[PDB]
Enzyme design. Structure first.
Site, short mmCIF file in Angstrom:
data_model
loop_
_atom_site.label_atom_id
_atom_site.label_comp_id
_atom_site.label_asym_id
_atom_site.label_seq_id
_atom_site.Cartn_x
_atom_site.Cartn_y
_atom_site.Cartn_z
N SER A 37 90.24 129.47 77.37
CA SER A 37 90.20 130.24 76.20
C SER A 37 91.07 129.80 75.08
CB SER A 37 89.89 131.94 76.77
OG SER A 37 88.93 132.05 76.92
N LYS A 49 90.10 128.26 71.97
CA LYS A 49 89.18 129.15 70.73
C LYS A 49 89.78 129.25 69.62
CE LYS A 49 86.97 133.04 73.85
NZ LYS A 49 86.88 134.05 74.39
N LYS A 55 98.04 133.20 72.80
CA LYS A 55 96.53 133.52 73.59
C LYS A 55 96.48 133.15 74.77
CE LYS A 55 91.93 133.97 73.47
NZ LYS A 55 91.95 134.44 74.77
C1 LIG Z 1 88.81 132.09 78.19
O1 LIG Z 1 90.41 131.85 79.02
C2 LIG Z 1 88.17 133.29 78.83
C3 LIG Z 1 88.67 134.89 78.87
N1 LIG Z 1 90.44 134.92 78.35
S1 LIG Z 1 91.25 135.89 78.48
O2 LIG Z 1 92.37 135.57 77.13
O3 LIG Z 1 90.89 137.01 78.97
O4 LIG Z 1 92.35 134.84 79.85
C4 LIG Z 1 89.72 134.58 80.44
C5 LIG Z 1 88.15 133.76 81.44
N2 LIG Z 1 87.79 132.65 80.21
C6 LIG Z 1 86.93 131.67 80.71
O5 LIG Z 1 86.74 130.95 79.11
N3 LIG Z 1 86.36 132.07 81.80
C7 LIG Z 1 85.87 130.03 81.59
C8 LIG Z 1 84.66 129.92 82.53
C9 LIG Z 1 83.27 130.24 82.12
C10 LIG Z 1 82.20 130.92 83.15
N4 LIG Z 1 80.91 131.05 81.45
C11 LIG Z 1 79.52 130.81 82.54
#
Ligand SMILES: *C(=O)[C@@H]1[C@H](NS(=O)(=O)O)CCN1C(=O)NCCCCNC
Ligand SMILES: [Cl-]
Length: 361
Positions: free
Chosen positions: A62, A65, A314
């Site tokens: 993330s 982002k 982040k």
């Molecule tokens: C991004 O890392 C998001 C969440 N962000 S956070 O700020 O809460 O750490 C944590 C898990 N996230 C993410 O993108 N995970 C990737 C797996 C993708 C599965 N989707 C099917």
């Protein structure tokens, strides 16, 4: 003394957390007084013995982002979209859906009205399936009222920004955004020639994990980069004026806050805190309930400059990796902590806080 002290301080912050969380490999990069400093620990791959270096590629999940927000900042910058545009303005397939009544800003800042953390398992990386998912989705509560942290939310924001620019999101990042930022070790799709740099990720019983394809993966969690390149991105954020004006403006657009939830002020990608703040408060801002539960927002009367005595940060993860980035605009200070285990956010913040505390002292 200075070199010895900084190594002493970073080793002291990092080593116990690595051991306690069984992290095979971890890279730190710190920007301090206009100079980069790198500290590399352990193994990129336990099996082949490749060591972590400042050029090892890690999945940042993330944290991607903030790159997505930079692309959106560019589209804004360039008058191709506005934050108050309706989502369906930028994708005809969404006209007639609930996205007629949801703004780009709502999508970027997770207030569209209950889009979930992730796309459901039933939605594959497929344009039609993604289209159909958004067409059928209904808000749980009024757009603009509650924050629910969401990959499909900001994912769509990034996708629509790309559409407003008339090119695929992935192509824009590779061909425009990364080159503009001077990033040659930053990838959505790691070239075969650079795969020797790509760390192994580790999960339960040390099973090997690298991130697989998913819907809007590029926008939500697609970036693989090195500690050195991610610090270059931090340095661009600390000094946008050092970039050609279009990109300077793009970065500035990610340093504007729209509302608060508790101690956190929400920007595009970046989340901000007053600085100094206690370690426990910064951990709470990056805790599981923040990611998983809806929170009522406190809207600001006007966007707020996320600069001066603040910490912008982040967290990001994939199944095999755990990343954290934090910087203090008013102190020209930044740091990057990348690991090849998904370890608790609180522990990432603990390392960073110890480094920042030691630097102040
Ligand atoms: C991004 O890392 C998001 C969440 N962000 S956070 O700020 O809460 O750490 C944590 C898990 N996230 C993410 O993108 N995970 C990737 C797996 C993708 C599965 N989707 C099917
Ligand atoms: Cl997702």
């Amino acid at each position: 003394a200075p070199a010895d002290r900084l190594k002493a301080l970073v080793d002291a912050a990092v080593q116990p957390v690595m051991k306690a969380n069984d992290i095979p490999g971890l890279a730190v990069a710190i920007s301090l007084k206009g100079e980069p400093h790198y500290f590399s620990y352990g193994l990129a791959s336990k099996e082949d013995g490749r060591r972590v270096t400042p050029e090892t590629l890690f999945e940042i999940g993330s944290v991607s982002k903030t790159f997505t927000a930079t692309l959106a900042g560019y589209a804004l910058t360039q008058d191709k979209m506005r934050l108050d545009d309706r989502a369906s303005q930028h994708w005809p397939a969404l006209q007639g859906s609930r996205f007629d009544g949801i703004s780009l800003l709502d999508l970027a800042t997770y207030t569209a009205g209950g889009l979930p953390l992730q796309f459901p398992d039933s939605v594959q990386k497929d344009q039609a399936q993604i289209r159909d998912y958004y067409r059928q989705w209904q808000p749980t509560y009024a757009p603009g009222s509650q924050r629910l942290y969401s990959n499909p939310s900001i994912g769509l924001f990034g996708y629509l920004a790309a559409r407003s620019l008339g090119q695929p999101f992935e192509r824009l990042m590779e061909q425009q955004v990364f080159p503009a930022l001077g990033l040659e070790q930053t990838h959505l799709d790691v070239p075969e020639a650079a795969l020797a740099q790509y760390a192994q990720g580790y999960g339960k019983d040390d099973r090997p994990l690298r991130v697989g394809p998913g819907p809007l993966d590029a926008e939500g969690y697609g970036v693989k980069t090195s500690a050195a390149d991610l610090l270059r991105f931090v340095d661009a954020n600390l000094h946008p004026e050092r970039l050609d004006r279009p990109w300077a403006q793009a970065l500035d657009a990610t340093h504007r806050g729209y509302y608060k939830v508790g101690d956190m002020t929400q920007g595009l990608g970046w989340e901000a805190y007053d600085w100094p703040i206690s370690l426990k408060r910064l951990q709470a801002g990056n805790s599981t309930p923040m990611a998983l539960q809806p929170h009522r927002i406190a809207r600001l009367p006007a966007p707020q400059a996320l600069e001066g005595q603040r910490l912008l940060n982040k967290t990001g993860s994939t199944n095999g990796f755990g990343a954290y980035v934090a910087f203090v605009p008013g102190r020209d200070l930044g740091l990057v902590i990348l690991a090849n285990r998904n370890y608790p956010n609180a522990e990432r913040v603990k390392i960073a806080y110890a480094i920042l505390s030691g630097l102040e002292q």
